């Protein structure tokens, strides 16, 4: 989200409240983006702006669909996009072609000059301030001469955006977790030693079949390389435990009973944090064996001290002609993550690279001073996480934890924790809130009536649901939310009890799902990792696909691409992020697809 208001500010017509005003009221209808990648939602949305604000939200209300536009019938950037007949527009841009051909490998393209372009323009509308500023944006609007010296002023402007696309990224930009993703790939790593996690929720089976004859292939194709399964024996009876342990013993799998593990330092407090969730998921309180699966990942005894991969219990593996036949390979840093990119259109530039990170496969090196480092680095960030989760949940930039912090439900949690003298914990939060969502009452008095009142399509009806919830009118409630589903009341008039009581309860189970999973993920998981990463990037500028740079470890996406994570270093094969450079459409995996550890599905993975 954070490059829709430049656009906006830029060629849409706004300012600063505006620009953001509008996103408060543009997304209630998430995904604004589509609009901005064409640019013609911002045309249009810039001719109703300069009729007042109130004019741009009336049209966005009375609207059918949005992106469905099409045309009708100090801003020294912007004012240089408009009309490059302009000297100064044209100077800009010759310049922008000689950036390109000392930059990159072949003859540069369009959105590859459009790109260098606006990178000058927005840095010359950055180094002018004041009045002459105000004149370089009536000049270029005028279309006269290069003032004297402007040629001057721009070559050390010039020289910097070449200099950022030409030279290697210095080892202050590769800072990886604590260590400098380096270029030679010194560090060592298996294609064959593997590790993977089960916690099980059903202490009679203590791992699906199916899962099961997958590590069987897994032990299987590796030859003689580990194929390690860390696991948990208080969560088996004594009868199933020895099943399982005699059924790894007969298939090759290295069972690791992480209960007994001795350990110290951050390892022992990821091991009782993660005791603690499988507590309190054996006794129906919130605990969650995924979150677990995410904090044992990182002890260092359950890695081992030889190079290993993590991966996810189910992963799949491209066994067969096609895989790796070397046991050994090298890349630039101490851990690999996985990761891949997303590209977002952005009309005449290019587009953008949004990265992303997992670690459903996570390659580790040989026991070393700087896998130590990296490890301890995650580890902290991940107990850190746990020790503040009322200070994460308002910090968070997740959406959905956003909305929790303003349900007065939660408020109300907390009052209790804090005049009770209990901290929040995880698995309490995620407790409270699955009793909340059990039923509608519960639920409407967790959330706002407010927020009721929004997502139910009448928030004019506050009031009203507020009286109907102070006595008992729990009537209202239902039709309100069914008739925001099944469209009108005219259709909730055709449904009976049995029916309509079998539409909340999905309805509320979707609702849980949506708080629950980032209380896991955002945690311990790859979105809590993904946070602890995010410092590496720029900030400053968005992040744009070059395809033919000279020096293309002069970005650091392209940098991670080819030596930090474990792309082309193993034969494990994810789908749950889009390879590198993936095309926008192309992430249309995600229109194929509640997993393994969500409430419902664990719900049934005993029952
Ligand atoms: O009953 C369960 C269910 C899950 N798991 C663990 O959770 C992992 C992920 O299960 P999966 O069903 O594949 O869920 P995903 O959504 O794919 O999991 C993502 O989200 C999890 C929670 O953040 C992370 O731990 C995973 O690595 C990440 O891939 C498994 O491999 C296990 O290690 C258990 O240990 N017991």
Redo the contacts with the bound molecule.
């Keep these: 989200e954070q490059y829709w208001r430049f656009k906006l500010m830029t060629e849409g017509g706004c300012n600063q409240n505006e620009a953001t005003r509008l996103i408060t009221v543009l997304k209630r209808k998430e995904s604004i983006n589509k609009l901005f990648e064409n640019d013609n939602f911002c045309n249009r949305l810039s001719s109703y702006m300069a009729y007042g604000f109130g004019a741009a939200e009336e049209w966005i209300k009375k609207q059918q669909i949005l992106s469905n536009i099409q045309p009708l019938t100090p801003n020294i950037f912007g004012a240089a996009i408009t009309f490059g007949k302009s000297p100064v527009v044209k100077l800009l841009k010759q310049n922008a072609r000689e950036i390109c051909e000392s930059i990159l490998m072949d003859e540069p393209n369009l959105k590859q000059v459009e790109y260098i372009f606006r990178l000058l323009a927005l840095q010359v509308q950055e180094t002018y301030s004041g009045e002459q500023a105000e004149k370089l944006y009536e000049c270029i609007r005028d279309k006269k001469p290069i003032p004297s010296k402007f040629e001057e002023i721009l070559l050390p402007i010039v020289n910097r955006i070449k200099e950022n696309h030409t030279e290697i990224l210095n080892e202050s930009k590769r800072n990886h977790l604590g260590v400098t993703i380096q270029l030679n790939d010194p560090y060592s790593f298996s294609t064959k030693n593997s590790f993977?996690?089960?916690?099980?929720?059903?202490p009679n089976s203590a791992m699906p079949k199916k899962?099961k004859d997958i590590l069987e292939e897994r032990a299987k194709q590796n030859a003689p390389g580990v194929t390690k399964l860390?696991?948990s024996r208080a969560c088996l009876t004594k009868k199933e435990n020895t099943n399982f342990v005699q059924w790894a013993k007969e298939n090759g799998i290295t069972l690791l009973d992480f209960d007994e593990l001795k350990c110290q330092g951050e390892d022992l407090e990821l091991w009782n944090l993660a005791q603690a969730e499988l507590k309190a998921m054996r006794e129906g309180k919130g605990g969650?064996?995924?979150?677990?699966?995410?904090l044992?990942?990182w002890i260092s005894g359950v890695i081992g001290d030889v190079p290993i991969a993590?991966?996810?219990?189910?992963?799949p593996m491209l066994t067969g002609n096609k895989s790796i036949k070397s046991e050994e390979v090298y890349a630039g840093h101490p851990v690999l993550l996985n990761m891949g990119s997303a590209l977002v259109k952005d009309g005449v530039n290019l587009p953008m690279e949004n990265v992303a990170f997992?670690?459903?496969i996570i390659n580790f090196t040989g026991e070393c001073k700087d896998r130590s480092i990296a490890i301890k680095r995650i580890a902290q960030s991940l107990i850190g996480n746990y020790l503040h989760v009322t200070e994460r949940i308002s910090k968070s930039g997740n959406p959905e934890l956003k909305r929790l912090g303003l349900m007065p439900g939660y408020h109300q949690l907390l009052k209790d924790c804090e005049e009770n003298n209990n901290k929040l914990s995880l698995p309490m939060l995620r407790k409270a809130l699955t009793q909340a969502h059990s039923n509608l009452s519960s639920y409407v008095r967790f959330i706002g009536v407010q927020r009721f009142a929004e997502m139910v399509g009448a928030p004019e009806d506050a009031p009203l649901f507020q009286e109907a919830l102070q006595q008992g009118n729990t009537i209202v409630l239902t039709n309100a939310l069914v008739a925001y589903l099944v469209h009108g009341m005219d259709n909730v008039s055709r449904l009976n009890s049995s029916e309509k009581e079998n539409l909340i309860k999905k309805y509320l189970g979707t609702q849980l799902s949506l708080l629950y999973?980032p209380l896991?993920?955002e945690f311990?998981?790859?979105?809590?990792v993904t946070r602890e990463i995010l410092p590496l990037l720029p900030t400053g500028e968005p992040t744009r696909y070059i395809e033919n740079l000279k020096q293309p470890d002069a970005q650091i996406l392209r940098v991670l691409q080819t030596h930090a994570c474990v792309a082309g270093k193993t034969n494990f094969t994810?789908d749950?992020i889009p390879n590198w450079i993936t095309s926008s459409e192309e992430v249309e995996r995600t229109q194929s697809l509640g997993?393994?550890?969500?409430p419902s599905?664990?719900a049934r993975?005993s029952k």
Excluded: H
Excluded at 310 to 315: C, K
Excluded at 524 to 528: I, K
């Design positions: 993977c996690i089960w916690f099980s929720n059903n899962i860390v696991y969650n064996p995924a979150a677990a699966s995410d044992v990942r993590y991966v996810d219990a189910d992963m997992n670690t459903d999973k896991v993920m311990s998981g790859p979105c809590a994810s749950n997993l393994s550890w969500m599905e664990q993975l």
